[PDB]
């Protein structure tokens, strides 16, 4: 059967970037040209591989990570980037094999007066390692005195909501992002091209 990309790409709601979702894709035929030929994606950039070669390759499994960020942050979903998303939310490795796919989701994820459902992590003492995921919510100690779980001065909740309103400039509008990565083990290959 064809790989169920629609479950990922056409999901009703996406994950917040700090709690980004990973879906394993196995035991199916993947026609990657249905994706890269599409006029719907404003970003489709592959690293370590060419998109027109994907259909010729067999993998043990394929993985789809998905989340929502602001338009101006899509450039951080790339090897070697820095910033709040790359540093504290979703980190690709410096040498990456995979594809980054993104599209404007203003019509789905913004709301008159504001959609605040989507969050990102603002405060974190150190950068994420590649493919690390941090969903902790400890009060962030920004001063010399410990917080003991109490918000207050210099003691901050680490997550912050995006403010997605339809009148936002494009760089402040929500973008849905799918990162495809590929896995090759000494195991049967279960996702092949057509």
């Amino acid at each position, epitope marked *: 059967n064809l790989c169920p990309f629609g479950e990922v790409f056409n999901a009703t709601r996406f994950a917040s970037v700090y709690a980004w979702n990973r879906k394993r894709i196995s035991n199916c035929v993947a026609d990657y040209s249905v994706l890269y030929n599409s006029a719907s994606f404003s970003t489709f950039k592959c690293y370590g591989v060419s998109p027109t070669k994907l259909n010729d390759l067999c993998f043990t499994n394929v993985y789809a990570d998905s989340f929502v960020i602001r338009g101006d942050e899509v450039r951080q979903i790339a090897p070697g980037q*820095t*910033g*709040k998303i790359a*540093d*504290y939310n979703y980190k690709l490795p410096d040498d990456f094999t995979g594809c980054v796919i993104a599209w404007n989701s203003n019509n789905l994820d913004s709301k008159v007066g*504001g959609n605040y459902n989507y969050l990102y992590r*603002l*405060f*974190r*003492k*150190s*950068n994420l390692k590649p493919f690390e995921r941090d969903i902790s919510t400890e009060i*962030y*100690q*920004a*001063g*010399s*005195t410990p917080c003991n779980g109490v918000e207050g001065f*210099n003691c*901050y909740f680490p997550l*912050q909501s995006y*403010g*997605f*309103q339809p*009148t*936002n*400039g*494009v*760089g*402040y509008q929500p973008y849905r992002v799918v990162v495809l990565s590929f896995e090759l083990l000494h195991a049967p290959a279960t996702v092949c091209g057509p």
Partner: single-chain antibody
Amino acid sequence: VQLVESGGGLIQPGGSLRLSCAASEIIVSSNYMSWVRQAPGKGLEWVSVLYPGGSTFYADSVKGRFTISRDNSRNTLYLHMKSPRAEDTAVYYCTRALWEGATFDYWGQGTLVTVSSDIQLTQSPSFLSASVGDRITITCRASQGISSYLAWYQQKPGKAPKLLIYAASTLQSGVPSRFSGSGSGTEFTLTISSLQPEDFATYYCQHVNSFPGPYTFGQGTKLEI
């Protein structure tokens, strides 16, 4: 509780300079820490920021010439000015950024450095003369919708800017209630309901954004008697 700059001075070109900013109670390495500068008679310019995790970002006017760093054991932020030019002459403020990692709630007193020889924000009016008790409005307009990512500052002569309002309408703790902010998207207004004599100052709006860009601050409004 405080940020204290040092290391400024008057230098001839062709050298190097290092500013330092020693913090208390604020922990430098846990915060979005920045340098903001102000040339004599001009507006504010965000120069560089150092993230808690160590990423650094610089305005295009100083990229390649300035470096920001920190010493965790001395709880100190530094600005290393390599090849300083006359156009770097300014008062240099150390700041901590809180809301969205770009709203500056604490400022050092600033240190003077003299060197011998994309969304745009428009603030109106540039000059505003009024009397005590007047109701005054200052408006900030952005070239694209920026939701509520805006803050307002008051700068008295000789002093560091002071945060009044952030998230467009949220009044900073300790600011009198006659100050209020309104608007969203592309138009934001600072209202002072009943002008008092201590309110005569220069006011700045700021598009609250994660990186030091050239249009971070409005050009300012000089409020005069």
